[PDB]
Amino acid sequence: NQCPTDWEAEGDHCYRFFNTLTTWENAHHECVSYSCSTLNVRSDLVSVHSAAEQAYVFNYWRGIDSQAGQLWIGLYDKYNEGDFIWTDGSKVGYTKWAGGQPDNWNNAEDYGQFRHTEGGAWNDNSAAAQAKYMCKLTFE
Amino acid sequence: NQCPTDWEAEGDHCYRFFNTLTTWENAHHECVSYSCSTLNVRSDLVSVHSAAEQAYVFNYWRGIDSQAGQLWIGLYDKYNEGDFIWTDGSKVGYTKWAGGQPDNWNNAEDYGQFRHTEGGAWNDNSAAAQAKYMCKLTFE
Ligand SMILES: CC(=O)N[C@@H]1[C@@H](O)[C@@H](O)[C@@H](CO)O[C@@H]1O
Ligand SMILES: CC(=O)N[C@@H]1[C@@H](O)[C@@H](O)[C@@H](CO)O[C@H]1O
Ligand SMILES: [Ca+2]
Ligand SMILES: [Ca+2]
Ligand SMILES: [Ca+2]
Ligand SMILES: [Ca+2]
Ligand SMILES: [Ca+2]
Ligand SMILES: [Ca+2]
C-alpha cells in the first residue's frame, strides 16, 4: 500500500489509532497536525461513510485496545445544536447512533464517539469527557 | 490506492509526471518540494530499481507525452565523476544505459535521463539541458 509508516490502508484512505485518553478537542487538533499541504493530504478525526468503514475502524480499534471505553470520531454539533457534521467536510450519509442517542445530555454533548459495544454504536459526549482516538488521511 | 491526487500508484510508491521542460536542478527541487515531513514522506526525482519499475515509469511518461525528448531521473555523478548514484540514497543495482552512454560529454554531463526511445534507455546530460521530469514518493 501507499500509506505513510505507522498508518494502515483501507480503500482510498489511511487510518491511525492513538491509544491515549484525551479530550475530543485535543484529539481533533492532534489528527489535523499530521496534514500536509504540499500533497493536499488532509489528516483529521475519522469520518465513517458505510457499514464496511464502520466495521474496519471498530475492528482496528478493538484489535489493539480491549479496555472498556470509547473512541472519538470527527462528528460534532458544536456549531449548530442537533446538526451533526464531519470535521473533514464530507457529507453525512451513514449513521450508527446507539439506541437513545444522540441526546445532548445535560446540554453539553456535541462530540461523536464509538462505544466499545454493539459494533461501535455512536454516542454524543462532552468537551470534558475522555476517549481514545483515530485519525484518517484523505487525499484531497 | 492511497496516493495523493494527481499521483499514480505502483507497488510501495507513488509517481507523478510533470510535462514541462526544465533543467535537472530545477526538476530536483520541484520533486523534493512535494515532501511531507509530518508523514515522513520523502519526494524526490524517480529512482529505478528493476526492469519493471523502468517499464512502469517509461509507459507512464509515454502515456501522456508524444514529444521527442527526455525525462529527468534522480541519477547523477555530480559529486563523484563516473559513479552514478540516486539522489534519494537508494542503491544503484539495475541500470539501462543506452549504447554509448554514459559518456560525460565535454566533461559536463552529470545528470541522468530516459530517452523517449528504446524503452527509456538512459543518457547522461548537462546542467544546461532541458527535459520533462518524474517524481517519486518514498514512505520512510
Ligand atoms: C539525448 C541524448 O542522448 N544526448 C546525447 C548526449 O548526452 C551526448 O552523449 C552525445 C554524444 O555525441 O550524444 C547524445 O546527444
Ligand atoms: C459512553 C456513552 O454512551 N455515554 C452516554 C452519555 O453520553 C449519556 O447520553 C447518557 C444518558 O443517560 O448515557 C450514556 O450511555
Ligand atoms: Ca451544543
Ligand atoms: Ca449537542
Ligand atoms: Ca449522549
Ligand atoms: Ca562532472
Ligand atoms: Ca559525469
Ligand atoms: Ca551523454
mmCIF file of C-alpha atoms and ligand atoms in Angstrom:
data_model
loop_
_atom_site.group_PDB
_atom_site.id
_atom_site.type_symbol
_atom_site.label_atom_id
_atom_site.label_comp_id
_atom_site.label_asym_id
_atom_site.label_seq_id
_atom_site.Cartn_x
_atom_site.Cartn_y
_atom_site.Cartn_z
ATOM 1 C CA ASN A 1 0.000 0.000 0.000
ATOM 2 C CA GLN A 2 0.932 3.692 -0.243
ATOM 3 C CA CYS A 3 0.216 4.749 3.348
ATOM 4 C CA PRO A 4 2.761 6.562 5.472
ATOM 5 C CA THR A 5 4.614 4.421 8.032
ATOM 6 C CA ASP A 6 2.511 3.576 11.086
ATOM 7 C CA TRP A 7 -0.748 4.238 9.182
ATOM 8 C CA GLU A 8 -2.982 1.402 7.932
ATOM 9 C CA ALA A 9 -4.502 1.207 4.454
ATOM 10 C CA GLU A 10 -8.150 0.600 3.612
ATOM 11 C CA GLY A 11 -9.835 1.704 0.408
ATOM 12 C CA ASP A 12 -8.723 5.171 -0.658
ATOM 13 C CA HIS A 13 -7.707 6.148 2.920
ATOM 14 C CA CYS A 14 -5.082 5.585 5.642
ATOM 15 C CA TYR A 15 -6.001 5.258 9.335
ATOM 16 C CA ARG A 16 -4.061 5.520 12.606
ATOM 17 C CA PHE A 17 -5.214 4.603 16.132
ATOM 18 C CA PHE A 18 -3.795 6.562 19.104
ATOM 19 C CA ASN A 19 -4.161 4.773 22.447
ATOM 20 C CA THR A 20 -4.197 7.929 24.595
ATOM 21 C CA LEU A 21 -7.157 9.156 26.644
ATOM 22 C CA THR A 22 -7.702 12.789 25.737
ATOM 23 C CA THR A 23 -10.486 15.306 25.027
ATOM 24 C CA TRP A 24 -12.215 15.498 21.643
ATOM 25 C CA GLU A 25 -10.753 18.956 21.060
ATOM 26 C CA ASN A 26 -7.232 17.728 21.615
ATOM 27 C CA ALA A 27 -7.716 14.548 19.553
ATOM 28 C CA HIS A 28 -9.040 16.765 16.718
ATOM 29 C CA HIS A 29 -6.015 19.114 16.946
ATOM 30 C CA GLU A 30 -3.617 16.122 17.044
ATOM 31 C CA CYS A 31 -5.116 14.499 13.948
ATOM 32 C CA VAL A 32 -5.133 17.772 11.997
ATOM 33 C CA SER A 33 -1.452 18.374 12.838
ATOM 34 C CA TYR A 34 -0.359 15.496 10.518
ATOM 35 C CA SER A 35 -1.869 17.192 7.445
ATOM 36 C CA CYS A 36 0.378 18.051 4.519
ATOM 37 C CA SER A 37 -0.480 20.881 2.151
ATOM 38 C CA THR A 38 2.272 20.077 -0.395
ATOM 39 C CA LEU A 39 0.465 16.814 -1.285
ATOM 40 C CA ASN A 40 -3.077 18.066 -0.343
ATOM 41 C CA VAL A 41 -3.278 15.400 2.312
ATOM 42 C CA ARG A 42 -5.873 16.131 4.993
ATOM 43 C CA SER A 43 -5.405 14.360 8.309
ATOM 44 C CA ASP A 44 -8.421 14.589 10.581
ATOM 45 C CA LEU A 45 -10.534 12.652 13.043
ATOM 46 C CA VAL A 46 -12.039 9.608 11.315
ATOM 47 C CA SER A 47 -15.274 10.082 9.290
ATOM 48 C CA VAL A 48 -17.393 6.994 8.664
ATOM 49 C CA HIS A 49 -19.351 6.565 5.388
ATOM 50 C CA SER A 50 -20.507 2.953 5.317
ATOM 51 C CA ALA A 51 -21.067 -0.163 7.410
ATOM 52 C CA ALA A 52 -17.834 -1.581 5.958
ATOM 53 C CA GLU A 53 -15.872 1.503 7.046
ATOM 54 C CA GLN A 54 -17.564 1.357 10.470
ATOM 55 C CA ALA A 55 -16.538 -2.320 10.883
ATOM 56 C CA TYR A 56 -12.975 -1.670 9.739
ATOM 57 C CA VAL A 57 -12.461 1.263 12.103
ATOM 58 C CA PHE A 58 -14.062 -0.578 15.045
ATOM 59 C CA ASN A 59 -12.136 -3.835 14.352
ATOM 60 C CA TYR A 60 -8.829 -1.918 14.036
ATOM 61 C CA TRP A 61 -9.506 -0.149 17.336
ATOM 62 C CA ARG A 62 -10.576 -3.232 19.321
ATOM 63 C CA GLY A 63 -7.728 -5.323 17.884
ATOM 64 C CA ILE A 64 -5.333 -3.109 19.841
ATOM 65 C CA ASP A 65 -7.428 -1.760 22.735
ATOM 66 C CA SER A 66 -9.551 -4.098 24.887
ATOM 67 C CA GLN A 67 -10.377 -1.659 27.717
ATOM 68 C CA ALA A 68 -13.989 -0.560 28.250
ATOM 69 C CA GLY A 69 -14.329 2.865 26.768
ATOM 70 C CA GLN A 70 -14.917 4.986 23.722
ATOM 71 C CA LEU A 71 -13.182 6.197 20.525
ATOM 72 C CA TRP A 72 -13.520 9.799 19.297
ATOM 73 C CA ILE A 73 -14.634 10.267 15.695
ATOM 74 C CA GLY A 74 -14.867 13.512 13.723
ATOM 75 C CA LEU A 75 -18.643 14.026 14.129
ATOM 76 C CA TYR A 76 -19.864 17.086 16.059
ATOM 77 C CA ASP A 77 -22.737 19.524 16.531
ATOM 78 C CA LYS A 78 -20.881 22.325 18.421
ATOM 79 C CA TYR A 79 -21.646 24.988 15.795
ATOM 80 C CA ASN A 80 -25.390 24.127 15.332
ATOM 81 C CA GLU A 81 -27.068 22.059 18.106
ATOM 82 C CA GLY A 82 -28.605 18.872 16.735
ATOM 83 C CA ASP A 83 -26.984 19.130 13.294
ATOM 84 C CA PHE A 84 -24.101 16.630 13.341
ATOM 85 C CA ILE A 85 -21.388 17.216 10.737
ATOM 86 C CA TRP A 86 -17.955 15.729 9.935
ATOM 87 C CA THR A 87 -14.829 17.836 10.650
ATOM 88 C CA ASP A 88 -13.310 16.781 7.306
ATOM 89 C CA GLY A 89 -16.261 18.477 5.479
ATOM 90 C CA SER A 90 -17.604 15.257 3.945
ATOM 91 C CA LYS A 91 -21.380 14.877 3.800
ATOM 92 C CA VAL A 92 -23.117 12.745 6.428
ATOM 93 C CA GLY A 93 -24.841 9.655 4.958
ATOM 94 C CA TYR A 94 -24.202 6.608 7.045
ATOM 95 C CA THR A 95 -25.061 6.828 10.735
ATOM 96 C CA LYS A 96 -24.919 4.226 13.544
ATOM 97 C CA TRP A 97 -26.329 6.012 16.593
ATOM 98 C CA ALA A 98 -26.822 3.812 19.698
ATOM 99 C CA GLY A 99 -30.372 3.477 21.000
ATOM 100 C CA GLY A 100 -31.301 6.695 22.815
ATOM 101 C CA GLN A 101 -28.550 8.731 21.120
ATOM 102 C CA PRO A 102 -27.776 11.431 20.336
ATOM 103 C CA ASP A 103 -29.369 13.064 23.408
ATOM 104 C CA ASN A 104 -27.352 16.206 24.210
ATOM 105 C CA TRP A 105 -27.221 15.075 27.823
ATOM 106 C CA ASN A 106 -27.004 17.966 30.268
ATOM 107 C CA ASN A 107 -26.995 20.253 27.200
ATOM 108 C CA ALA A 108 -23.253 19.708 26.860
ATOM 109 C CA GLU A 109 -22.755 16.763 24.485
ATOM 110 C CA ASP A 110 -21.543 17.827 20.995
ATOM 111 C CA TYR A 111 -18.756 15.333 20.186
ATOM 112 C CA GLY A 112 -19.202 11.964 18.489
ATOM 113 C CA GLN A 113 -17.580 8.686 19.529
ATOM 114 C CA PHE A 114 -17.886 4.911 19.112
ATOM 115 C CA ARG A 115 -18.862 2.818 22.103
ATOM 116 C CA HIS A 116 -16.856 -0.377 22.611
ATOM 117 C CA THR A 117 -20.117 -2.405 22.260
ATOM 118 C CA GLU A 118 -22.670 -3.042 19.551
ATOM 119 C CA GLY A 119 -20.086 -2.844 16.768
ATOM 120 C CA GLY A 120 -19.091 0.705 17.702
ATOM 121 C CA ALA A 121 -22.568 2.268 18.047
ATOM 122 C CA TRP A 122 -22.258 6.024 18.323
ATOM 123 C CA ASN A 123 -22.772 8.365 21.247
ATOM 124 C CA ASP A 124 -22.523 12.095 21.666
ATOM 125 C CA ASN A 125 -20.379 13.148 24.641
ATOM 126 C CA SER A 126 -18.998 16.387 26.263
ATOM 127 C CA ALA A 127 -15.816 18.503 25.997
ATOM 128 C CA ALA A 128 -14.757 17.189 29.434
ATOM 129 C CA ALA A 129 -15.029 13.523 28.529
ATOM 130 C CA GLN A 130 -12.018 11.434 27.601
ATOM 131 C CA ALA A 131 -11.667 8.760 24.983
ATOM 132 C CA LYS A 132 -9.085 7.172 22.671
ATOM 133 C CA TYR A 133 -8.863 8.492 19.094
ATOM 134 C CA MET A 134 -8.430 7.578 15.460
ATOM 135 C CA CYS A 135 -7.066 9.685 12.582
ATOM 136 C CA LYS A 136 -7.818 9.342 8.864
ATOM 137 C CA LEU A 137 -5.991 10.626 5.787
ATOM 138 C CA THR A 138 -7.976 11.985 2.881
ATOM 139 C CA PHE A 139 -6.225 12.668 -0.412
ATOM 140 C CA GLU A 140 -7.956 15.894 -1.426
ATOM 141 C CA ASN B 1 -4.985 3.409 -3.884
ATOM 142 C CA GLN B 2 -3.544 5.694 -1.196
ATOM 143 C CA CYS B 3 -1.616 8.110 -3.409
ATOM 144 C CA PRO B 4 -2.239 11.848 -3.317
ATOM 145 C CA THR B 5 -4.386 13.327 -6.035
ATOM 146 C CA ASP B 6 -2.541 13.605 -9.381
ATOM 147 C CA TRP B 7 -0.049 10.928 -8.355
ATOM 148 C CA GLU B 8 -0.174 7.338 -9.617
ATOM 149 C CA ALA B 9 0.350 4.174 -7.592
ATOM 150 C CA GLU B 10 2.687 1.313 -8.249
ATOM 151 C CA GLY B 11 3.947 -1.021 -5.578
ATOM 152 C CA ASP B 12 5.081 0.745 -2.412
ATOM 153 C CA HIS B 13 5.374 4.112 -4.156
ATOM 154 C CA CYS B 14 3.582 6.946 -5.881
ATOM 155 C CA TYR B 15 4.825 8.635 -9.076
ATOM 156 C CA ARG B 16 3.964 11.855 -10.853
ATOM 157 C CA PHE B 17 4.846 13.005 -14.331
ATOM 158 C CA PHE B 18 5.393 16.683 -14.989
ATOM 159 C CA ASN B 19 5.025 17.527 -18.648
ATOM 160 C CA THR B 20 7.166 20.713 -18.576
ATOM 161 C CA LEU B 21 10.652 21.219 -19.924
ATOM 162 C CA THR B 22 13.137 22.281 -17.269
ATOM 163 C CA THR B 23 16.675 21.721 -16.064
ATOM 164 C CA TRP B 24 17.701 18.783 -13.865
ATOM 165 C CA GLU B 25 18.470 21.171 -10.973
ATOM 166 C CA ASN B 26 15.029 22.723 -11.091
ATOM 167 C CA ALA B 27 13.365 19.348 -11.528
ATOM 168 C CA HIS B 28 15.182 18.067 -8.480
ATOM 169 C CA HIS B 29 13.920 20.984 -6.323
ATOM 170 C CA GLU B 30 10.357 20.659 -7.767
ATOM 171 C CA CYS B 31 10.223 16.970 -6.836
ATOM 172 C CA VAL B 32 11.651 17.500 -3.318
ATOM 173 C CA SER B 33 9.020 20.243 -2.796
ATOM 174 C CA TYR B 34 6.270 17.564 -2.567
ATOM 175 C CA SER B 35 7.814 16.078 0.608
ATOM 176 C CA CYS B 36 5.679 15.878 3.748
ATOM 177 C CA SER B 37 7.713 15.798 6.996
ATOM 178 C CA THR B 38 4.685 15.178 9.225
ATOM 179 C CA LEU B 39 4.031 11.837 7.481
ATOM 180 C CA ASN B 40 7.704 11.004 6.800
ATOM 181 C CA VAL B 41 7.050 11.168 3.069
ATOM 182 C CA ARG B 42 10.181 11.916 1.061
ATOM 183 C CA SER B 43 9.570 13.141 -2.502
ATOM 184 C CA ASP B 44 12.422 13.084 -4.989
ATOM 185 C CA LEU B 45 13.349 12.542 -8.590
ATOM 186 C CA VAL B 46 12.475 8.994 -9.613
ATOM 187 C CA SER B 47 14.902 6.176 -8.835
ATOM 188 C CA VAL B 48 14.647 2.983 -10.885
ATOM 189 C CA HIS B 49 15.500 -0.401 -9.372
ATOM 190 C CA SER B 50 14.281 -3.013 -11.824
ATOM 191 C CA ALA B 51 13.102 -3.668 -15.371
ATOM 192 C CA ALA B 52 9.504 -3.480 -14.033
ATOM 193 C CA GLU B 53 9.995 -0.082 -12.490
ATOM 194 C CA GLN B 54 11.770 1.088 -15.656
ATOM 195 C CA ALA B 55 8.799 -0.007 -17.814
ATOM 196 C CA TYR B 56 6.272 1.446 -15.380
ATOM 197 C CA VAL B 57 7.956 4.842 -15.393
ATOM 198 C CA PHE B 58 8.572 4.835 -19.178
ATOM 199 C CA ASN B 59 4.993 3.771 -20.004
ATOM 200 C CA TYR B 60 3.533 6.291 -17.586
ATOM 201 C CA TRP B 61 5.535 9.098 -19.187
ATOM 202 C CA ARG B 62 4.794 7.980 -22.727
ATOM 203 C CA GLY B 63 1.074 7.542 -21.911
ATOM 204 C CA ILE B 64 0.908 11.338 -21.671
ATOM 205 C CA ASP B 65 3.775 12.760 -23.693
ATOM 206 C CA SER B 66 4.044 12.327 -27.517
ATOM 207 C CA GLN B 67 7.062 14.591 -27.997
ATOM 208 C CA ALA B 68 10.560 13.559 -28.834
ATOM 209 C CA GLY B 69 12.700 14.319 -25.834
ATOM 210 C CA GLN B 70 13.949 13.102 -22.497
ATOM 211 C CA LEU B 71 12.799 12.528 -18.914
ATOM 212 C CA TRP B 72 14.972 13.533 -15.939
ATOM 213 C CA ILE B 73 15.554 10.853 -13.289
ATOM 214 C CA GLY B 74 17.303 11.070 -9.956
ATOM 215 C CA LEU B 75 20.587 9.594 -11.216
ATOM 216 C CA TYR B 76 23.719 11.767 -11.055
ATOM 217 C CA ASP B 77 27.517 11.784 -10.729
ATOM 218 C CA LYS B 78 27.895 15.464 -9.817
ATOM 219 C CA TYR B 79 29.900 14.744 -6.662
ATOM 220 C CA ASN B 80 31.992 11.818 -7.902
ATOM 221 C CA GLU B 81 32.570 11.707 -11.632
ATOM 222 C CA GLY B 82 31.868 8.358 -13.173
ATOM 223 C CA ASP B 83 29.988 6.919 -10.156
ATOM 224 C CA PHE B 84 26.247 7.402 -10.848
ATOM 225 C CA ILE B 85 24.071 7.376 -7.712
ATOM 226 C CA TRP B 86 20.463 8.047 -6.807
ATOM 227 C CA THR B 87 19.586 11.355 -5.086
ATOM 228 C CA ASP B 88 17.157 9.513 -2.752
ATOM 229 C CA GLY B 89 20.005 7.498 -1.215
ATOM 230 C CA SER B 90 18.817 4.104 -2.562
ATOM 231 C CA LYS B 91 21.497 1.895 -4.076
ATOM 232 C CA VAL B 92 22.130 1.521 -7.795
ATOM 233 C CA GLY B 93 21.555 -2.068 -8.855
ATOM 234 C CA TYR B 94 19.612 -2.088 -12.082
ATOM 235 C CA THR B 95 20.857 0.068 -14.921
ATOM 236 C CA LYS B 96 19.669 0.576 -18.500
ATOM 237 C CA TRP B 97 22.206 2.846 -20.154
ATOM 238 C CA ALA B 98 21.780 3.441 -23.866
ATOM 239 C CA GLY B 99 24.551 2.243 -26.104
ATOM 240 C CA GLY B 100 27.487 4.583 -25.890
ATOM 241 C CA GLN B 101 26.316 6.072 -22.608
ATOM 242 C CA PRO B 102 27.188 7.386 -20.162
ATOM 243 C CA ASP B 103 29.871 9.404 -21.937
ATOM 244 C CA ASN B 104 30.389 12.537 -19.784
ATOM 245 C CA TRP B 105 30.240 14.565 -22.963
ATOM 246 C CA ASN B 106 32.510 17.637 -22.991
ATOM 247 C CA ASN B 107 33.320 16.807 -19.330
ATOM 248 C CA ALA B 108 29.952 18.320 -18.424
ATOM 249 C CA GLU B 109 27.297 15.549 -18.254
ATOM 250 C CA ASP B 110 26.347 14.508 -14.734
ATOM 251 C CA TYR B 111 22.528 14.127 -14.805
ATOM 252 C CA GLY B 112 20.573 11.105 -15.804
ATOM 253 C CA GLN B 113 17.507 10.925 -18.005
ATOM 254 C CA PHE B 114 15.430 8.408 -20.035
ATOM 255 C CA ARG B 115 15.360 8.773 -23.800
ATOM 256 C CA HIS B 116 11.884 8.511 -25.417
ATOM 257 C CA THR B 117 13.135 5.526 -27.442
ATOM 258 C CA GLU B 118 14.466 2.025 -26.641
ATOM 259 C CA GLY B 119 12.194 1.563 -23.642
ATOM 260 C CA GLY B 120 13.658 4.649 -21.912
ATOM 261 C CA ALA B 121 17.355 3.740 -22.252
ATOM 262 C CA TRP B 122 19.401 6.139 -20.128
ATOM 263 C CA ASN B 123 21.625 9.044 -21.083
ATOM 264 C CA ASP B 124 23.811 11.419 -19.047
ATOM 265 C CA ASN B 125 23.278 15.079 -19.928
ATOM 266 C CA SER B 126 24.424 18.534 -18.850
ATOM 267 C CA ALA B 127 23.232 21.158 -16.354
ATOM 268 C CA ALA B 128 22.114 23.346 -19.305
ATOM 269 C CA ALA B 129 19.973 20.702 -20.918
ATOM 270 C CA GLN B 130 16.167 20.592 -20.663
ATOM 271 C CA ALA B 131 13.842 17.598 -20.202
ATOM 272 C CA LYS B 132 10.466 16.637 -18.718
ATOM 273 C CA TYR B 133 10.627 15.011 -15.233
ATOM 274 C CA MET B 134 9.172 12.368 -12.985
ATOM 275 C CA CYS B 135 8.865 12.395 -9.174
ATOM 276 C CA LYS B 136 8.516 9.534 -6.696
ATOM 277 C CA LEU B 137 7.253 9.334 -3.124
ATOM 278 C CA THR B 138 9.008 7.107 -0.629
ATOM 279 C CA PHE B 139 7.236 6.412 2.660
ATOM 280 C CA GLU B 140 10.107 6.263 5.089
HETATM 281 C C1 LIG C 1 19.653 12.895 -25.503
HETATM 282 C C2 LIG C 1 20.978 12.249 -25.624
HETATM 283 O O1 LIG C 1 21.102 11.037 -25.545
HETATM 284 N N1 LIG C 1 22.003 13.081 -25.811
HETATM 285 C C3 LIG C 1 23.338 12.593 -26.019
HETATM 286 C C4 LIG C 1 24.374 13.392 -25.245
HETATM 287 O O2 LIG C 1 24.302 13.308 -23.843
HETATM 288 C C5 LIG C 1 25.785 13.218 -25.728
HETATM 289 O O3 LIG C 1 26.130 11.900 -25.178
HETATM 290 C C6 LIG C 1 26.023 12.973 -27.200
HETATM 291 C C7 LIG C 1 27.375 12.477 -27.644
HETATM 292 O O4 LIG C 1 27.526 12.735 -29.094
HETATM 293 O O5 LIG C 1 25.021 12.230 -27.844
HETATM 294 C C8 LIG C 1 23.664 12.352 -27.468
HETATM 295 O O6 LIG C 1 23.413 13.672 -27.993
HETATM 296 C C1 LIG C 2 -20.477 6.469 26.617
HETATM 297 C C2 LIG C 2 -21.944 6.776 26.482
HETATM 298 O O1 LIG C 2 -22.637 6.283 25.613
HETATM 299 N N1 LIG C 2 -22.413 7.652 27.380
HETATM 300 C C3 LIG C 2 -23.787 8.069 27.401
HETATM 301 C C4 LIG C 2 -23.900 9.548 27.619
HETATM 302 O O2 LIG C 2 -23.379 10.415 26.591
HETATM 303 C C5 LIG C 2 -25.254 9.999 28.069
HETATM 304 O O3 LIG C 2 -26.000 10.020 26.847
HETATM 305 C C6 LIG C 2 -26.083 9.042 28.891
HETATM 306 C C7 LIG C 2 -27.553 9.470 29.081
HETATM 307 O O4 LIG C 2 -28.012 8.652 30.166
HETATM 308 O O5 LIG C 2 -25.952 7.653 28.640
HETATM 309 C C8 LIG C 2 -24.694 7.099 28.212
HETATM 310 O O6 LIG C 2 -24.874 5.798 27.639
HETATM 311 CA CA CA C 3 -24.158 22.311 21.895
HETATM 312 CA CA CA C 4 -25.195 18.576 21.068
HETATM 313 CA CA CA C 5 -25.011 11.083 24.766
HETATM 314 CA CA CA C 6 31.282 16.015 -13.533
HETATM 315 CA CA CA C 7 29.716 12.925 -15.391
HETATM 316 CA CA CA C 8 25.599 11.577 -22.646
#
